[PDB]
Amino acid sequence: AQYEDGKQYTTLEKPVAGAPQVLEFFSFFCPHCYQFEEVLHISDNVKKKLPEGVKMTKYHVNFMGGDLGKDLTQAWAVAMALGVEDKVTVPLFEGVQKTQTIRSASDIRDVFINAGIKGEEYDAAWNSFVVKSLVAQQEKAAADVQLRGVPAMFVNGKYQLNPQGMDTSNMDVFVQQYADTVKYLSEK
């Protein structure tokens, strides 16, 4: 058929109970993640095609970048808690990978301050238990899908996107097929 298990996607041996309907994992340290978000716009193209009443969730991972990597997962928790993901995603990627001006937790915070988040607001979030549980949620999600690498995307906690099984030459055919596959999976 058009969409095939083992081709555009794979199926989790061990489906995840109560998972987000569309769950993306990434790292601000991840060069393929930079491409996925800043050049290919995968998240955006997937969301443009999602059915009504399907929300897209995006989590950061710890395993790249040591202390800074964990700082970024905690800052991504701050971003989710404050609801400012669409204001910090681009400058966090560029600061880590383009200008490489993000070297410490303080450098991360600067990105938020510059994006209009009050310092008192960032710091209270940063030190909050709400944010600690959001970090724990992201870590738990990774454990639940038995995550091995980023970027990755899972649908209804049952299916894993398999971009290696898609066409890779028109960047845009690739992106279209990726987004089309997510929509297909969401209705499966």
Short mmCIF file of C-alpha atoms in Angstrom, two decimals, residues 45-128:
data_model
loop_
_atom_site.label_atom_id
_atom_site.label_comp_id
_atom_site.label_asym_id
_atom_site.label_seq_id
_atom_site.Cartn_x
_atom_site.Cartn_y
_atom_site.Cartn_z
CA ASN A 45 4.41 21.43 8.26
CA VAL A 46 3.07 18.61 10.39
CA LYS A 47 0.82 21.00 12.32
CA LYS A 48 -0.55 22.53 9.11
CA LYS A 49 -2.02 19.12 8.27
CA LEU A 50 -3.08 17.72 11.64
CA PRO A 51 -6.80 16.91 12.10
CA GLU A 52 -8.94 19.18 14.29
CA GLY A 53 -8.50 18.39 17.99
CA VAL A 54 -5.00 16.94 17.61
CA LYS A 55 -2.33 18.82 19.54
CA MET A 56 1.41 18.62 18.82
CA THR A 57 3.80 18.23 21.76
CA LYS A 58 7.54 18.85 21.67
CA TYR A 59 10.12 17.69 24.23
CA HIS A 60 13.84 18.37 24.71
CA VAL A 61 16.36 15.63 25.55
CA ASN A 62 19.32 15.53 27.93
CA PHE A 63 21.83 13.21 26.33
CA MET A 64 23.55 15.78 24.11
CA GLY A 65 25.82 18.45 25.59
CA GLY A 66 26.46 17.43 29.20
CA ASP A 67 25.55 20.10 31.76
CA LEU A 68 24.44 22.55 29.09
CA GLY A 69 22.19 19.92 27.54
CA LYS A 70 20.31 19.49 30.84
CA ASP A 71 20.20 23.24 31.26
CA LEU A 72 18.45 23.37 27.88
CA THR A 73 15.90 20.73 28.86
CA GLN A 74 15.15 22.77 32.01
CA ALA A 75 14.87 25.98 29.96
CA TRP A 76 12.58 24.22 27.48
CA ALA A 77 10.47 23.30 30.53
CA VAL A 78 10.44 27.01 31.40
CA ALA A 79 9.35 27.76 27.82
CA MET A 80 6.46 25.29 28.05
CA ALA A 81 5.45 26.53 31.52
CA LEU A 82 5.38 30.14 30.35
CA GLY A 83 3.96 29.36 26.93
CA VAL A 84 6.74 31.16 25.02
CA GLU A 85 8.00 28.31 22.81
CA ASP A 86 7.41 30.33 19.61
CA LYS A 87 9.54 33.17 20.92
CA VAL A 88 12.58 31.25 22.07
CA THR A 89 12.91 28.24 19.74
CA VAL A 90 14.69 30.12 16.96
CA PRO A 91 17.11 32.10 19.17
CA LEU A 92 17.90 29.01 21.27
CA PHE A 93 18.82 27.02 18.13
CA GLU A 94 20.86 29.88 16.67
CA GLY A 95 22.59 30.66 19.94
CA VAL A 96 23.65 27.07 20.49
CA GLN A 97 24.50 26.18 16.86
CA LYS A 98 24.87 29.30 14.69
CA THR A 99 26.54 32.04 16.78
CA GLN A 100 27.53 29.51 19.49
CA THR A 101 27.02 32.26 22.05
CA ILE A 102 25.11 29.92 24.37
CA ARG A 103 27.76 28.36 26.59
CA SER A 104 26.14 28.47 30.06
CA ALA A 105 22.79 28.54 31.85
CA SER A 106 23.15 32.31 32.09
CA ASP A 107 23.50 32.52 28.28
CA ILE A 108 20.25 30.59 27.93
CA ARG A 109 18.48 32.99 30.28
CA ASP A 110 19.70 35.98 28.22
CA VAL A 111 17.79 34.62 25.22
CA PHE A 112 14.61 34.70 27.33
CA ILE A 113 15.32 38.19 28.72
CA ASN A 114 15.96 39.47 25.20
CA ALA A 115 12.75 37.87 23.97
CA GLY A 116 10.76 39.93 26.48
CA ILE A 117 10.45 37.51 29.40
CA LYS A 118 10.95 39.34 32.70
CA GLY A 119 13.91 38.15 34.73
CA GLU A 120 11.79 37.58 37.81
CA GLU A 121 9.40 35.54 35.66
CA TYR A 122 12.12 33.30 34.18
CA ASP A 123 13.82 32.74 37.56
CA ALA A 124 10.64 31.81 39.44
CA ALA A 125 9.78 29.34 36.66
CA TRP A 126 13.37 28.07 36.52
CA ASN A 127 13.35 27.25 40.23
CA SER A 128 9.73 25.94 40.31
#
